Amino acid sequence: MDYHEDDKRFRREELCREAEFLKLKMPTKKVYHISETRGLLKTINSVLQKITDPIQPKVAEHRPQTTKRLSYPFSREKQHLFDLTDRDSFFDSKTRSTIVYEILKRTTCGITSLLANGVYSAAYPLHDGDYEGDNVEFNDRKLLYEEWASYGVFYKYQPIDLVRKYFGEKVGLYFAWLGAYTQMLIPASIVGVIVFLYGCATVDENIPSMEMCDQRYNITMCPLCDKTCSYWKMSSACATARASHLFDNPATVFFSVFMALWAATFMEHWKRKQMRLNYRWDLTGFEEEEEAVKDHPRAEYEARVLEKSPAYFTNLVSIIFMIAVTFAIVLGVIIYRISTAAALAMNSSPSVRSNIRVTVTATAVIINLVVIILLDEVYGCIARWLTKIEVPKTEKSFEERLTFKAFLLKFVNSYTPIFYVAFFKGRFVGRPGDYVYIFRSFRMEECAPGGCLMELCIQLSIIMLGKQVIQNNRKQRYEVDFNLEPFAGLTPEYMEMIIQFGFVTLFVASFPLAPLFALLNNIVEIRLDAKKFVTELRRPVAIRAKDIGIWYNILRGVGKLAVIINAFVISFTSDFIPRLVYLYMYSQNGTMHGFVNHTLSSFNVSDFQNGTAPNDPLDLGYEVQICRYKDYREPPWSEHKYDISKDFWAVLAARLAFVIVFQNLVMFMSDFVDWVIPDIPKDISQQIHKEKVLMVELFMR
Amino acid sequence: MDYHEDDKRFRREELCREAEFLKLKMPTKKVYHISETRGLLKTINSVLQKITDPIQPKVAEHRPQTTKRLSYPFSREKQHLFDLTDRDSFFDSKTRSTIVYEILKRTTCGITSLLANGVYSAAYPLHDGDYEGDNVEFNDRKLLYEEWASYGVFYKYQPIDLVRKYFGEKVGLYFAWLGAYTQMLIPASIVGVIVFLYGCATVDENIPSMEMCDQRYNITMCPLCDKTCSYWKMSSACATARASHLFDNPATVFFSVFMALWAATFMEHWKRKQMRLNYRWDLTGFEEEEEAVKDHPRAEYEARVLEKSPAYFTNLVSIIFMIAVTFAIVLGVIIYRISTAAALAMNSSPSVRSNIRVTVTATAVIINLVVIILLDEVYGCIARWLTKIEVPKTEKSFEERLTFKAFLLKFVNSYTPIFYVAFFKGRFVGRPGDYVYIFRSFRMEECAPGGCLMELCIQLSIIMLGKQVIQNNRKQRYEVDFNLEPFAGLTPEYMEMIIQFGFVTLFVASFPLAPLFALLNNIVEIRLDAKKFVTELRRPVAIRAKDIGIWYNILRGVGKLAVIINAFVISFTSDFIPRLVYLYMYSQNGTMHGFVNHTLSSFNVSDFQNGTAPNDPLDLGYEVQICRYKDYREPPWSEHKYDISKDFWAVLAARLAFVIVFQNLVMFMSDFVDWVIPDIPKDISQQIHKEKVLMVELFMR
Ligand SMILES: [Ca+2]
Ligand SMILES: [Ca+2]
Ligand SMILES: [Ca+2]
Ligand SMILES: [Ca+2]
């Protein structure tokens, strides 16, 4: 049981002599202000860095950090830059660790240069006591384990003041943002359940659904593949049409508008909440610019350029990153294209005879998700290498550029198959008179029969649930925390949340119960992150932060892109605009009767291109003469046959007009939601006004 | 010649006794810190308010206001909140007037309550000396008259430090913004002249222009009016087609993109320039919130609601303002509709026989501009009355709400005829088989023959030049400034500049030399505003300001609306998308030959509706059987005649797709221009860093 002390570093004790000299030179600089104690356990030494009482005001004044006062107006104690009070244990462990880390970073041979050189293996603070220990005494770690880091306390609120008090305000800000996201997902999940129940309660009487599942019509569709498969009855796929209505009803369009407004309201609710937490924790912006130490490779680079005496190199690095992003996009496209074929071969190998084209698609999206998880680490390493060779000036810019590059790579390799299936999947394929052949021998495949909106939503389901699947399916203190996993950072924990937010905002024009899945994921992910921070990972160094930072701009950009993505999803891949066009232009009775016969276009089977027709035309029991495809083209009994008709141009014009109306009106409503809701709450403003006039009154006398 | 003194107020000296008692009560409160001297000239007294030396540090410390320091690092003197230096005339006239006005506003019976009550006619400062006076001694007013307020010094730069030193920093900020606007209009004007010369150098060989001005084709167009006029040859209007190419060439589309980027660049340049001027003048944000005195009607309202013991009343006021704005819109539409008819009757009264339909349109837009100038004051008074009955809490919110209401009313009544001619002018009229009749007897008019883009640009020309036309076509001091016109405010001077900016950004997709007209207007308007501020108007009270305020948000909103307005102008009223559609879909040779025959649609003259055909079908010398209109409809020799064909839907789909592409790409490029250009300049940041570390170093010792 070590005494009350602070951040400790780990040495390498058995060139080696130069490393030992560098390991001993800095403690000689630490003699004046840091106490030390060495320890041997079996073969490797370690050192301790307890700091003394008079040096806490020495560093707490040069770096301005807040301190609670004595007076309590309205039973709420005020704060000040420094207050001197006896029984000096009021400096909690996070403040002491921050002061010691600032001492380590300021004193040169910074501690990061010695850690990257290799003379120091690690430098971590120690957790206060132990969690779930026998006969422990009022531990903050134990309190956070029993009240916050438990699966049986998931419904209760989280002690955000306690997690700020223990793991600092960056981890506190992350958990407050995650709690705000989880709390805002509840009304979206409720409305999503309502919309899904509306879809389930209407699909029985949905007129296209009954027209497409009806027998005695005997409509024979076009083969949709090469000479391997053949003509298929449309009714044989209309069970997909029963699943199709649950995702493209007008309630889903209202749901898209509601989630645009919900993303806006969440953005300014978090904008107010971060100012509320800034009022609660620290409003001092005295941490001024150009105070962090520069990078040692940056120092070497500037020494080199002053000896040999930039923007061009940084522009070249950004260009290389741009072709890297384009390569990632085309790589994701080709990975999805080969993964669906690999799943098709795997399912056709033992002749399972599913005859549903859903289990094979689930296998395809599962192996695609596996490959995406495999290349996520590759893209992270590529982004880190690209950012390190640019050698930014400070650590903050280094972290922000690494964050930007990693987020763009995660965005492209996590949304490339979904953007491929949603938009560029079965539109560029031509008429059955003549198809388009990529590499002059392979046809570009059409999507799922009866509508690949079902394919899009099951890919969304599997990819969103895969993140849940991969997570759900005599000794002294210093060696115990040495056995613990080191703390990496909040950046990969923000990455998955931002990707989930992209799923929630970008693709609920096709999946109304995505907020429900996101809420069910976040409910257990809050407790998993709590258990990981309390039990497994080492104590974070509690770096000071004011707001979230770059991820707020990332959320704003995702929300702005979600408007145009949702508009394009509703217009093009949702098959809702053609229903409106048939209802208001071609109905002739005011009802949606004959919509399926209007959408389908005839094709004479004598006009295939060089044996593309199937080898078995008698599989249906009759010799079919005309198949029906879906492209809005002229019938074969016309003067200009297999040509684009007026209906295609009318439907396309209506789709583009709806994109214009949706995008403009939804951006205007989001701007109105931004304008109405103030950034600063009125109560926080009157409280900070009262606090500043009360401190002026107190310091007047 | 009065001595060195400050702001003086004007009394009413011959109930009257109560007014006299209120006029004498407040000078008794002025005895302690203000000196006074009374003066009679013929019948009315006046008072003087020279302030004493010890009161200047008393008020200059409670309200933190700038004071130059003695030391000059890099030949630039620093700034501190207060410095004590002998020869106390370093406090210039604007600071003394501001201190005296703050004294007047703080001391109760505020000075605005006594001025609105009626006991005080005016309260104005005196100009330092006189301009252009004989044997004057280094006057700032004289220096600004010969160096800034003159028409012979228009090419030189303006002394922005001197105008800040004399009329304060609000007038300085207005003149700096006007100078930045004039300087940024120069490259836009150069590119506009280049684009206009490109249009002039191509119109000779423009294939639609030669096809439309060619003889021997003998195309007879539809009557385009009621039974009054008759069929007209298209060539008889193709001189308008020679003017039409100068405004809808592809250089104009590139010009629209260039002005979107130019508006973004101007916004970021002014954003940097206002921070530069903030560094030069004052960076202190110590003027905290809730320090201004509340309104007396607001005090009466809160006293009433506390005695009798809001959001509903404010919402009702905003609703009344919304129906007021809608009424202004429909009023502007009907004013244009009756003004064109009034001009037509006025021109047809003496039988001028112009036969050009341009002089009558110029008369229509001139009288429309006259009516708009007439109702601008009406809308300003309506906005002031609507804002005053809402009784806002402070003066700043009162001015901002009055500004918002006045700007919306100015926007609607200044852009309603232009938005009417651009978009809703000749599109809702039907085919010549059957027209639409408003009020069941009057046809909705078609616009000018050969293209009403010419009508739109001549209306833009006249409305933009009308603001230039209405502007170009033994005694002591206190009585001299009493004879001068009182200072109203910078709000009406900002209104015309914002309307000019709306003209520059919203409508250069149809008028490429609008920045040239704006530059030629601003060149003389800077000098007229300078002469008005120096010679005619009284001295402003020099209220402190940091940025412009609401007008920056207004400029941002105008620039954001300009993207979609320009996209709709290029797609719908520019006739550029149909040229692209004919070139890439119907050309059959790759050239623009037969475009006029493709756009025009035939109509049999046997199919007019109830005598709508003209009374004189033999005016052209032949009995015409088929006229040609412009609606993309099926020919009469068709199974479905006079019906919308495939070409209309294709052209409409291309127009909407171009609106989508233009809006999305142009907003992305504007966001990229905002993102690349930093808000704070790097040199200003390094200088404020150097200044703060040097003041820390000085105050350390
Ligand atoms: Ca996590
Ligand atoms: Ca807001
Ligand atoms: Ca003016
Ligand atoms: Ca910027």
Numbering used by the authors:
A (entry chain B), B (entry chain A): 117 to 130, 165 to 259, 267 to 466, 488 to 651, 683 to 910
Task: Copy text from the publication.
A similar mechanism underlying channel activation also applies to the ion channel TMEM16A, which opens in response to an increase in the intracellular Ca2+ concentration (Caputo et al, 2008; Schroeder et al, 2008; Yang et al, 2008). TMEM16A mediates important physiological processes such as epithelial chloride transport and smooth muscle contraction and has been proposed to be a therapeutic target for diseases including asthma, hypertension, stroke, and cystic fibrosis (Huang et al, 2012; Danahay et al, 2020; Al‐Hosni et al, 2022; Galietta, 2022). The protein is a homodimer, with each subunit containing an ion conduction pore and a principal Ca2+‐binding site that are closely apposed (Dang et al, 2017; Paulino et al, 2017a, 2017b). Both pores act independently and are activated by the binding of two Ca2+ ions to the principal site (Jeng et al, 2016; Lim et al, 2016).
In addition to this ionic interaction, our previous study has identified several residues around the Ca2+‐binding site as important determinants of channel activation, which is manifested by a profound decrease in the potency of Ca2+ upon mutation to alanine (Lam et al, 2021). Here, we focus on Leu 647 on α6 and Ile 733 on α8, both within the π‐helical region, which are brought into van der Waals contact in the Ca2+‐bound state upon α6 activation. To understand the rearrangements underlying the efficacy of pore opening, we determined a cryo‐EM structure of L647V/I733V, whose gating properties are similarly affected compared to the less conservative mutant L647A/I733A but which is characterized by a more severely perturbed ion conduction pathway, in the presence of a saturating Ca2+ concentration. With an overall resolution of 3.29 Å, the final map shows well‐defined density for the entire protein, including the bound agonist Ca2+ in its principal binding site. Single‐particle analysis of L647V/I733V reveals a major conformation that is distinct from the wild‐type channel. In this structure, the disruption of the L647/I733 interaction results in an incomplete rearrangement of α6, with the helix adopting an intermediate, partially activated conformation. The described change in conformation is accompanied by a loss of the density corresponding to the Ca2+‐binding part of α6, indicating that the helix has become more mobile and that the interaction with bound Ca2+ is substantially weakened. The single‐bound Ca2+ is in a position similar to the lower ion in the doubly bound state and is coordinated by two acidic residues, Glu 705 on α7 and Asp 738 on α8, with no coordinating residues from α6 since its rearrangement is impaired.
